[PDB]
Design an enzyme around this catalytic site. Structure first.
Site, PDB file in Angstrom:
ATOM      1  N   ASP B  75       0.835  -1.222   0.000  1.00  0.00           N
ATOM      2  CA  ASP B  75       0.000   0.000   0.000  1.00  0.00           C
ATOM      3  C   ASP B  75       0.908   1.328   0.000  1.00  0.00           C
ATOM      4  O   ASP B  75       0.419   2.471  -0.334  1.00  0.00           O
ATOM      5  CB  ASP B  75      -1.075  -0.016   1.105  1.00  0.00           C
ATOM      6  CG  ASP B  75      -2.447  -0.688   0.646  1.00  0.00           C
ATOM      7  OD1 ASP B  75      -2.591  -1.399  -0.387  1.00  0.00           O
ATOM      8  OD2 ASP B  75      -3.396  -0.492   1.372  1.00  0.00           O
ATOM      9  N   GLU B 106      -4.951   4.232   1.723  1.00  0.00           N
ATOM     10  CA  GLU B 106      -3.772   3.399   1.573  1.00  0.00           C
ATOM     11  C   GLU B 106      -2.806   3.741   2.682  1.00  0.00           C
ATOM     12  O   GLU B 106      -2.035   2.891   3.156  1.00  0.00           O
ATOM     13  CB  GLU B 106      -3.006   3.631   0.260  1.00  0.00           C
ATOM     14  CG  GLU B 106      -3.606   3.174  -1.049  1.00  0.00           C
ATOM     15  CD  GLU B 106      -4.303   1.822  -1.019  1.00  0.00           C
ATOM     16  OE1 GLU B 106      -4.035   0.998  -0.145  1.00  0.00           O
ATOM     17  OE2 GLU B 106      -5.110   1.547  -1.915  1.00  0.00           O
ATOM     18  N   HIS B 109      -4.430   1.747   5.563  1.00  0.00           N
ATOM     19  CA  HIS B 109      -4.032   0.344   5.438  1.00  0.00           C
ATOM     20  C   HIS B 109      -2.560   0.177   5.857  1.00  0.00           C
ATOM     21  O   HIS B 109      -2.213  -0.700   6.630  1.00  0.00           O
ATOM     22  CB  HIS B 109      -4.158  -0.099   3.977  1.00  0.00           C
ATOM     23  CG  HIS B 109      -5.540   0.030   3.481  1.00  0.00           C
ATOM     24  ND1 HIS B 109      -5.921  -0.309   2.206  1.00  0.00           N
ATOM     25  CD2 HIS B 109      -6.656   0.435   4.121  1.00  0.00           C
ATOM     26  CE1 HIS B 109      -7.222  -0.132   2.082  1.00  0.00           C
ATOM     27  NE2 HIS B 109      -7.692   0.322   3.232  1.00  0.00           N
ATOM     28  N   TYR B 113      -1.138  -2.343   8.931  1.00  0.00           N
ATOM     29  CA  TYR B 113      -0.208  -3.423   8.857  1.00  0.00           C
ATOM     30  C   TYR B 113       0.951  -3.259   9.826  1.00  0.00           C
ATOM     31  O   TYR B 113       1.356  -4.220  10.479  1.00  0.00           O
ATOM     32  CB  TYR B 113       0.247  -3.622   7.399  1.00  0.00           C
ATOM     33  CG  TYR B 113      -0.868  -4.209   6.521  1.00  0.00           C
ATOM     34  CD1 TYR B 113      -1.495  -5.452   6.848  1.00  0.00           C
ATOM     35  CD2 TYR B 113      -1.313  -3.539   5.366  1.00  0.00           C
ATOM     36  CE1 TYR B 113      -2.543  -5.998   6.016  1.00  0.00           C
ATOM     37  CE2 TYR B 113      -2.342  -4.077   4.559  1.00  0.00           C
ATOM     38  CZ  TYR B 113      -2.954  -5.301   4.879  1.00  0.00           C
ATOM     39  OH  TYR B 113      -3.927  -5.793   4.021  1.00  0.00           O
ATOM     40  N   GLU B 169      -3.476  -4.579  -7.031  1.00  0.00           N
ATOM     41  CA  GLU B 169      -4.488  -4.512  -5.961  1.00  0.00           C
ATOM     42  C   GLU B 169      -5.538  -5.658  -5.843  1.00  0.00           C
ATOM     43  O   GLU B 169      -6.150  -5.786  -4.821  1.00  0.00           O
ATOM     44  CB  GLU B 169      -5.184  -3.122  -5.908  1.00  0.00           C
ATOM     45  CG  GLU B 169      -4.237  -2.059  -5.266  1.00  0.00           C
ATOM     46  CD  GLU B 169      -4.913  -0.889  -4.568  1.00  0.00           C
ATOM     47  OE1 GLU B 169      -6.030  -0.544  -5.031  1.00  0.00           O
ATOM     48  OE2 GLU B 169      -4.274  -0.295  -3.577  1.00  0.00           O
ATOM     49  N   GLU B 203      -9.774  -2.618  -1.036  1.00  0.00           N
ATOM     50  CA  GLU B 203      -9.124  -3.033  -2.288  1.00  0.00           C
ATOM     51  C   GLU B 203     -10.126  -3.461  -3.374  1.00  0.00           C
ATOM     52  O   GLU B 203      -9.927  -3.185  -4.575  1.00  0.00           O
ATOM     53  CB  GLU B 203      -8.111  -4.105  -2.030  1.00  0.00           C
ATOM     54  CG  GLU B 203      -7.161  -3.712  -0.927  1.00  0.00           C
ATOM     55  CD  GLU B 203      -6.143  -2.621  -1.307  1.00  0.00           C
ATOM     56  OE1 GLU B 203      -6.566  -1.548  -1.754  1.00  0.00           O
ATOM     57  OE2 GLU B 203      -4.913  -2.877  -1.128  1.00  0.00           O
ATOM     58  N   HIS B 206     -10.997  -0.448  -4.951  1.00  0.00           N
ATOM     59  CA  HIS B 206      -9.914   0.155  -5.690  1.00  0.00           C
ATOM     60  C   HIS B 206      -9.662  -0.452  -7.057  1.00  0.00           C
ATOM     61  O   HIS B 206      -9.102   0.208  -7.962  1.00  0.00           O
ATOM     62  CB  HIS B 206      -8.655   0.118  -4.876  1.00  0.00           C
ATOM     63  CG  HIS B 206      -8.739   0.874  -3.584  1.00  0.00           C
ATOM     64  ND1 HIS B 206      -7.723   0.868  -2.653  1.00  0.00           N
ATOM     65  CD2 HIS B 206      -9.712   1.671  -3.082  1.00  0.00           C
ATOM     66  CE1 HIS B 206      -8.069   1.632  -1.634  1.00  0.00           C
ATOM     67  NE2 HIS B 206      -9.271   2.132  -1.873  1.00  0.00           N
TER      68      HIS B 206
HETATM   69 CO   LIG Z   1      -4.853  -0.920   0.488  1.00  0.00          CO
HETATM   70 CO   LIG Z   2      -5.770  -0.212  -2.710  1.00  0.00          CO
END
Ligand SMILES: [Co+2]
Ligand SMILES: [Co+2]
Ligand SMILES: [Co+2]
Ligand SMILES: [Co+2]
Lengths: 288, 288
Positions: B75, B106, B109, B113, B169, B203, B206
């Site tokens: 991301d 993003e 995201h 993570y 993605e 995603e 996306h």
């Molecule tokens: Co993402």
């Molecule tokens: Co994305």
């Protein structure tokens, strides 16, 4: 790159793309404040304003419509600066975050102004006239041109462009933000003023951040240069609010409006780490 | 520019910066769905997972840690593609909006993570190893390199780069998204799986958007070319999930995982307006 290779904010260092090994908690905290202030235009209730707009005087609608004209695309420009320059040139993960959010919020401000303009001007003619104020109304054009210049100016340095954009987001907006707050005080246009509240709290954050970036810049423009880019912004914002669109139209004292703009620029100078320029008090009690 | 001058999405037409004279309601609706799905990592409660991570088997932690390794920066890449290419090259206001939001999501995201990786791997060694998996773990590198290539590839066209990023993605994420959903089914790691739910729904959005951009592209890559960029993604994602990091480690059947990846690519092909490539059924009931 030379000089740049020595700037933490711009050096091709990343070799990462990750966020948690958090390097700058100050920039990070700024991104968190912004994430926390998230709002959508859907939240501003415009249902009433359509008539509030009617209760207004012709000189006032004139005023409010020209002010909206400007806000219709400036947050356009900003995002076009942030996506093809700042969020780019900067390689610090915390700053790209702040910038990803700023762009998302500018597109919402941008949307907010349009909804406004559609709710108030129903006759299609005017509507298109205001939407394309960048190319129709001089005064705003002499504004949008300024911010538009630092975007393509291939000569200016990231130091100068950060200041200039801080001038655009704080000085070029302070004039109108003050006059809109006036209305709120005087009991007018609650949809306008409420939106004007949420948005203003964002631009405030966008300036401090700009100032913060400036302070992480190593080799920056000299004080005199900064004083001049800011001073110029003051004159273009003043001329706009007491000439091409006198705050007189909504019952405000130009002379004081001018003093406010300077008080704003002074607060911007402090923020950037320099001395005040004008040294004048903020004249509006509801602004200080 | 030539060919580009004839592409609605890319033509230097704007002469605007405003949003309400809404030109493409389909792109607009996509931006609204995304704005509606906004969430912050702060919302995923990770308090427990630290021990859930303990209840796991060594082969499983191995798996989950390598999977996180990848999600730690991809991301990152995406947003570096969107800010220095797509959100740029595109000049349609509704699309820049969708893209401003994608970038903001993003970075979240990306944050999600990291928090994950910090909550699970406390020993600093591993932690740095995983954070810099782009340059430490082959398999992921052979992934990040692929998406990283279409960014600087100065030859590929916006048509090819949109497909390729849709492959990144949707196909590069489908493998892990499936295996994480497996865990959820089997009662494991609720912080991981819940976050994996919110992120996956993004995603998905996306990709459809990427597909949608592709459909507004006039002069696009021929079907054979698209089939090959997608097919290649399948092989690199397969090899990853049944070789360098076999789903066997969490109790999954590689052979079926492969079939799923293909089912995913098939759904991507439909979306883009073409025929299925593999023609295989989605084998996981909890995915179809
Ligand atoms: Co993402
Ligand atoms: Co994305
Ligand atoms: Co704004
Ligand atoms: Co702003």
């Amino acid at each position: 790159n030379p000089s740049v290779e020595d700037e933490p904010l711009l050096r091709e260092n990343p070799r990462r793309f990750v966020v948690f090994p958090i390097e700058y908690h100050d920039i990070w905290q700024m991104y968190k404040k912004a994430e926390a202030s998230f709002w959508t235009a859907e939240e501003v209730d415009l249902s009433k304003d359509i008539q509030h707009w009617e209760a207004l005087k012709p000189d006032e609608r004139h005023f409010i419509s020209h002010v909206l004209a400007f806000f219709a695309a400036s947050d356009g420009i900003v995002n076009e600066n942030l996506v093809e320059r700042f969020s780019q040139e900067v390689q610090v993960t915390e700053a790209r975050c702040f910038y990803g959010f700023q762009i998302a919020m500018e597109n919402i401000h941008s949307e907010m102004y349009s909804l406004l303009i559609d709710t108030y001007i129903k006759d299609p003619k005017e509507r298109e006239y205001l939407f394309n104020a960048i190319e129709t109304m001089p005064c705003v054009k002499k504004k949008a041109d300024w911010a538009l210049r630092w975007i393509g100016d291939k000569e200016a340095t990231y130091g100068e462009r950060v200041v200039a954009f801080a001038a655009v987001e704080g000085i070029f907006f302070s004039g109108s933000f003050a006059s809109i707050f006036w209305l709120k005080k005087r009991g007018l246009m609650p949809g306008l003023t409420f939106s004007n509240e949420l948005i203003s709290r964002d631009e405030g954050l966008h300036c401090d951040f700009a100032c913060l970036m400036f302070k992480h810049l190593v080799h920056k423009p000299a004080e005199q240069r900064v004083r001049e880019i800011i001073t110029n912004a003051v004159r273009i914002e003043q001329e706009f609010l007491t000439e091409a669109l006198p705050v007189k139209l909504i019952g405000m004292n130009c002379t004081l409006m001018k003093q406010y703009i300077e008080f704003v620029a002074d607060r911007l100078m402090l923020e950037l780490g320099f001395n005040k320029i004008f040294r004048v008090e903020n004249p509006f009690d509801f602004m200080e």
